[PDB]
Amino acid sequence: QRYQPGWTQSLVSSMRGTLDKLKLIKSMTPMYLQQLAPVELAVIAPMLPF
Amino acid sequence: FFILALALPLTTDPCAPVKAFMTLANMMVGFETIPMDNQIYTQSRRASAF
């Protein structure tokens, strides 16, 4: 309430739209990190030189 | 979604209504959720698969 008065009404709506799209973007990366990537790290790890 | 919803009820495919519902269900992923049957035919499958 004490920050939006500095902005025009239309810009607020657009800002609301951009954030909403970022929330629901069909990015597969977070799935990869939770299910697949650890398996790959476990597989590779013993063959490391260090 | 408009085009598919209008076009579907004319085909002879018995599984047409399920596809009609899955279309909107797919487009709603992340906005609204529903309980599906298993992990394979989840809410994000192509509606044409059913």
The token duo for B31 is 């906005």
Q: Which residue of B has its CA nearest to A23?
A: B30
Cα–Cα dist A45/B1, whole Å: 47
Pairs of residues, one from chain A and one from chain B, whose beta carbons lie less than 8 Å apart: 4
Residues of B in contact with A23 (CB under 8 A): 30
Cα–Cα dist B21/B45, whole Å: 12
Method of determination?
cryo-EM
In Å, how far is A45's CA from the nearest CA of chain B? 30
Q: In angstroms, what is the resolution?
A: 3.3
Cα–Cα dist A42/A23, whole Å: 31
Cα–Cα dist B45/B48, whole Å: 8
Residues of B in contact with A30 (CB under 8 A): none
CB contact, 8 Å: B30 with chain A? Answer: yes
Cα–Cα dist A35/B1, whole Å: 32
Alpha helices in chain B (DSSP H): 2-7, 16-27
| Block residue for tokens 């650890």 | A38
Side-chain-side CA neighbours of residue A12 (13 Å)? 8
Contact call for residues B5 and B21 (beta carbons, < 8 A): no
